[PDB]
Design a protein around this ligand. Structure first.
Ligand code: ODL
Ligand code: ODL
Ligand code: FBP
Ligand code: FBP
Ligand code: FBP
Ligand code: FBP
Ligand code: OXL
Ligand code: OXL
Ligand code: OXL
Ligand code: OXL
Ligand code: K
Ligand code: K
Ligand code: K
Ligand code: K
Ligand code: MG
Ligand code: MG
Ligand code: MG
Ligand code: MG
Lengths: 422, 425, 436, 425
């Protein structure tokens, strides 16, 4: 029964053609949904009660579109998101962190506009986790956004939106200085021929996967759901193909901001992403990512590849990793393990931000500390196991890979352990 | 010899990549497509696309197959649509650069326990009106195909039966259906109501993969550019869907309400043409050819053996075309199954085979009507030169190019066994 | 170039020109061959063990010390000739030469003692002389038995029974020397600790032109099973009388290593020849060149694809450790082992990094020479009060001994493999450590 | 049949990995194909008798090597006459006649910087006596090859120059030497004294790999069966060395003292024949063909394009043979470079080309002696039928086998462009 589920016959295929031939509509997905969902907050999704339903449906990142609405409007949206998120904090083993992303208005006819400087300052003051920087055309645009965030915004992730020909042509220099990328297909589809957008999307996703940096696919993914309860056949195909392409996140704009079915749009992206993740041909994907990732003398990078290899060898249900900044979890995610990456962190901001990385499930640790550091580490690993059992990731008898470091503080991950559950 | 400009076009840097990941990383929006569009476009005929003048614009835009939906309209209405298609097609007979065959496909209303009475009558209408293809609705098992075949009667055994897979049973019994069918249509409209909407992409990719393995045509259909029924431009999901159906391996892509009743039928055809050309250049031929070769069983059939040798030879020299002489279309179909980048120019005396080979990706039919030469070898050479001169006129070939030529050792269908390398003079 | 660019700037272009590294980075086996370079010098310690047959040319204590220095790892006693008294004196001379280097535990070289049986002769199974010779082996503490003319699984069960309850730790290496042994190979390998491709008799029992097929098949199946395989007989035959071997002989040694042999053997070359020390030096020089020429990119990929999924934590840790070692160009993998098993499971994935096996068992230290790339370090300190401290001291002993021997250098990365509790069978941890 | 797929290591040939290919090698799986690696035997006192030479031709000797380091011109002229007399004693049965090449191995430069005066005289003797090949000793750079070519004069333009790599400089300047040479010899005797003995296998494997990539013949030489100079059977290292030279990709294997002066010249040839047949069946063609195709550059030469198409077609149908008509041997050499499992039966009228194609693995030369037919197409057909009749008599072909036939569009060398699938009747 285990080997009939989650497209495992198609996963064992010797060629990509045979993998396609073995895909089975009756093979049910079992793993938790790996690709994060970004939902744009607006009149249709602003209330606390509506936001609770969207969190339950699968929303991981709330997007604030600063092209419309005042600072007062956006501050109320942020407060409503935080109220809905904290309503589930009473059960720490099941609590789900939700990131808040600020999407800038952009440069308009201008570099960094004066409104963007004020909006970025608002973001830092309100503790946003991510900035989706509009119309990034070159590396100096990213440096300007970074400078506008100041010393208090050092920890905010900058995701550069590629929306025109120049952004595509200067992609490598933009990715180098960015934390990640958004394929902003709306403007991209007007700036370059509509029939070429799929080439830009596939190229950018491939380069972000190679760099190990998050990539978001955005705009018109389930467009018809703004007025209709069910999407078109092209829309479900688009969501599935963005996941198969290698996107870390998928996005909803008008579908959740102003449409009549915001919760249903989130549920639809969740249902498609789960099916598409099981249909990923891991045999070729892992081989290619492993071959292309450069040789490294960084112990976190070395431990990450060893852990992902070990996970595939034993069909590990999960890789439990301790992380301060999210970096150790991101380096595991870049190798696209089938095993869920359960990231145990004390940082509420890192817990929200790791939603940008495919297959990272953040757990915010709030248990009393242990006097002995080695005992504190072990208690965090047991917390990952207990949350994993409650959420359906793990069962007694499963094997897990545990990734830790040799001393406290960020940057010292160097250990991988094989553990039997219970 | 060819220049650096040649190797920058048609996604050639991405084509030379050693891995699929590197192939994706090398895709370039500035690398322009050069080859002729190989995925056929099926447009549904209706009130928005029935007039002779509108049909001429749709042929110019790229329509290769006209679909008649027998779920609506009388026999008289469909006979007038067929006459209008034929009138629009024959209006280009004066210019060899513009004349193109257009297939006519009858899409049945569907089943009741067996073949419905209306389907028996509609299939008989198809034979009487000389249709080329039947898109058989709601095929659930091999006996449904046998019933459609029997209803094509004494005169219509040459009509191609494309089975529409629209429900759970058709998906589960796919192998037995494909075995007795000429091809398959992934009919996503009903399929998306019969099975969970989130599973349709799995059924589409599986059916396309199995048809590619079997060397039989597969059509991707329904809601590909849906928003274009009322809007002049499609959504980002719609252009992505068309490109991904071509990258999946679909031989044909289809338009339904977009051309039958929408406000922009010509624009919908133009959009499918533009996307398909871009997506065909983005196909990773290096892995695709290797996998089709490895999966295809060994064969002692000379047509099959010649086809793989010709496709291998075409890749070796960057051949502009493979010119094949065919009476039934079979030798061209066996070349098409290996997905050459070279266009397959199929020269035939059969008007029906010329229309039907539009079902096979990358087959460009040329209908030959000259009186037959007394010496067979001279008649073969005249048809090969007709393919070369048509290719020159249409932009496929230039003097100095290399072409692969596929013929047989004697007249009649079934004897293809020869592959030649010719320098265009 | 992007996959090695940062490491090339850090370690230098000279590092990536040595040990056939340009040929190692090739995308195809054909390109790997085209890039093999006679100017690319080997750097790694020799990983294929050398078995030398003891005889009149190599029996003295002084001669044995030179053979240990030249690279002999396993001493073979051929029980087809010589009395029990003769073989007991050979064993005592080997042990005296081995213990003459015990003064420095960090450098000392364990040497295994292997008993090669006379065989069944015209009989159907275990002969009476073999029963007596196997009892002599147990009484004299031999580490390995090379069982002659093994034809079926019941032959190895008979050898096992003759070793008695006190010889349970002795490794049984089945010699495949005839058609039946080749045809029943799978059942023989299943119950054996390893195999010897005994080409002398095999080349008379089957057509001489088919021996290479049997050798390549048996080496491939042993590599797939993760069990040691020895290539034997006439590898450097002309060196019995000449100081230099023929072109076919150097080729044969290199190809046995490239095929995947864990051990290579010398018979008359060391037992009776005029150049026993030179024959050992020649096998050492060829094996180091051939080990660097192994196409690890395809070999590692194929060993992972063919090896079934495992729920054994030692097996899971071993593949993770070998993958980590390749990622950082690790100098060594340091492993703690009681029986040798954790080191054997690392060895089956054929890492380029040396596997430094730290053990308290003198017998396991001798026996791990059967596994390619395992360098045994015998730890003699009494146990620390706290088990975690005792584990740490053994890891540090491997590091310090490694540095003092040129295996490790300051700045190198090392992979360390340990377990969660004392006793054999609990290896489950892999650590990345920087050498300071 | 199942018996067919159990022979010639076919279970090991179908393996998905090289490791699984090794695990499936079977000592009971008998070789079926004809031996494709040529055997060069050095002529000396043990192999000069016309009667002894007839036995060596029957045992499998394809090339007779004359070592000009020993013996006078008078001695070598008698060797040549004895070889020719033994070879021509079988000319009375044209369907079984085996051509045998004559190769002149030069003394070398000695302590000098380039072409010695004795080599100039020996090379002139070679041209005057019609030798087919020159094995040029101690080639260190491209100018050494040009000097050998100049010494052959205007009448020796058709002689093949095989450069012997015997020292460090030859290995380091390998690429420039291969570029101007017809092929290479890995001369392990001197190479093993000029560089450390333990590094010779690296130079051998590298040079064989680069020659396979370039599509040029490579010879493995010296001490392959050394102990057979005095003993009836070789050592285990010697049989392994022969098998590994074939597995490495050598086109030819050589015997020196084993045939020139030893007591078992015929047995040494029989032993190389037996080992080479076993080793050729153990070649992992799945990976080898894939890598040769991937590495071989794109080509606009029709002979090269036809060759890859023909080899691909041969693998698809398990063709018993590829029958090629050739004037210079070039069309057969281009087929050989893709290492088909099918035997390349090369039909030629050139006695010299028939002798020289023995340098290319898997090429079986057939010398055609009939004068040209009046109709060129009939002359082509008669030569193809001669290849079939020779193949049937020699055991290469049987009724029911498929063969690939490679011809050109006009008489004269350089116009091969046709591949055809033929059933043996
Ligand atoms: O491992 S992957 O999932 N590769 C998917 C993939 C797609 C197309 C083809 C080429 C082909 C196209 C269509 C075919 O039907 C067919 O047989 C072959 C081969 C492989 C992967 C994904 C993302 C990044 C790296 C790697
Ligand atoms: O297709 S071939 O015959 N390749 C042979 C080959 C040998 C070793 C390995 C590396 C390895 C892998 C697995 C092993 O078991 C093992 O002993 C060594 C991989 C491939 C071929 C020959 C020549 C040129 C191109 C191609
Ligand atoms: O992923 P990051 O940010 O590098 O954090 C990993 C760090 O987490 C740990 O596992 C635990 O550290 P803390 O006890 O400081 O939380 C460290 O050993 C390791 O360096
Ligand atoms: O593709 P099909 O229908 O098998 O037809 C291929 C046939 O066409 C030819 O090339 C030409 O045949 P005709 O002269 O009869 O048209 C034959 O030699 C070959 O058998
Ligand atoms: O390779 P083996 O024989 O399984 O030994 C590995 C064992 O060695 C250890 O690392 C140390 O164990 P000891 O303290 O008993 O020597 C164990 O944790 C582990 O189980
Ligand atoms: O291999 P080569 O030397 O190019 O010879 C191939 C030539 O042989 C032929 O098949 C037959 O030519 P001939 O009739 O002159 O012998 C030509 O058509 C072709 O060009
Ligand atoms: O800004 C965006 O999100 C877009 O243009 O798609
Ligand atoms: O009939 C169709 O085309 C469908 O249901 O998609
Ligand atoms: O016994 C042996 O070692 C042999 O036969 O090779
Ligand atoms: O000259 C030769 O043949 C050699 O040195 O091997
Ligand atoms: K915005
Ligand atoms: K219909
Ligand atoms: K013995
Ligand atoms: K000479
Ligand atoms: Mg935008
Ligand atoms: Mg329908
Ligand atoms: Mg023996
Ligand atoms: Mg020499």
């Amino acid at each position: 029964a285990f080997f009939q589920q989650q497209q495992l016959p198609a996963a064992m295929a010797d060629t990509f053609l045979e993998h396609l031939c073995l895909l089975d509509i009756d093979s049910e997905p079992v793993a938790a949904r790996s690709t994060s969902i970004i939902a744009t907050i607006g009149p249709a999704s602003r209330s606390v009660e509506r936001l609770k339903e969207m969190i339950k449906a699968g929303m991981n990142i709330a997007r604030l579109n600063f092209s419309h609405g005042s600072h007062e409007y956006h501050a109320e949206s942020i407060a409503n998101v935080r109220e809905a998120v904290e309503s589930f904090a009473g059960s720490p083993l099941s609590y789900r962190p939700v990131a808040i992303a600020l999407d800038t208005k952009g440069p308009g006819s201008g570099g960094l506009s004066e409104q963007d400087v004020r909006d970025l300052r608002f973001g830092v003051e309100h503790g946003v986790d991510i900035v989706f920087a509009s119309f990034v055309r070159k590396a100096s645009d990213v440096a300007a956004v970074r400078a506008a965030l100041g010393p208090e915004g050092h920890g905010i992730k900058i995701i550069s939106k590629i929306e025109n020909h120049e952004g595509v042509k200067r992609f490598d220099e933009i990715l180098e200085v960015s934390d990640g990328i958004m394929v902003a297909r709306g403007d991209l589809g007007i700036e370059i021929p509509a029939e070429k957008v799929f080439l830009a999307q596939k190229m950018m996703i491939g380069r972000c996967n190679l760099a190990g940096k998050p990539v978001v696919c955005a705009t018109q993914m389930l467009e018809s759901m703004i007025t209709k309860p069910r999407p078109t056949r092209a829309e479900t195909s688009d969501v599935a193909n963005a996941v198969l392409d290698g996107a870390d996140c998928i996005m909803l704009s008008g579908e959740t901001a102003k449409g009549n079915f915001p919760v249903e749009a989130v549920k639809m992206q969740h249902a498609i992403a789960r099916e598409a993740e099981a249909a990923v041909y891991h045999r070729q994907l892992f081989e290619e990512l492993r071959r292309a990732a450069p040789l490294s003398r960084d112990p976190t990078e070395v431990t990450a590849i060893g852990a992902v290899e070990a996970a595939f060898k034993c069909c590990a249900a999960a890789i439990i990793v301790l992380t301060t900044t999210g970096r150790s979890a991101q380096l595991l995610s870049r190798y696209r393990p089938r095993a869920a990456v359960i990231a145990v962190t004390r940082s509420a901001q890192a817990a929200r931000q790791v939603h940008l990385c495919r297959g990272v499930f953040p757990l915010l640790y709030r248990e009393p500390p242990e006097a002995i550091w080695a005992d504190d580490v072990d208690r965090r690993v047991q917390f990952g196991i207990e949350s994993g059992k409650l959420r359906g990731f793990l069962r007694v008898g499963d094997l897990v890979i545990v990734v830790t470091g040799w001393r406290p503080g960020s940057g010292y991950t160097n250990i991988m352990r094989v553990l039997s559950i219970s």
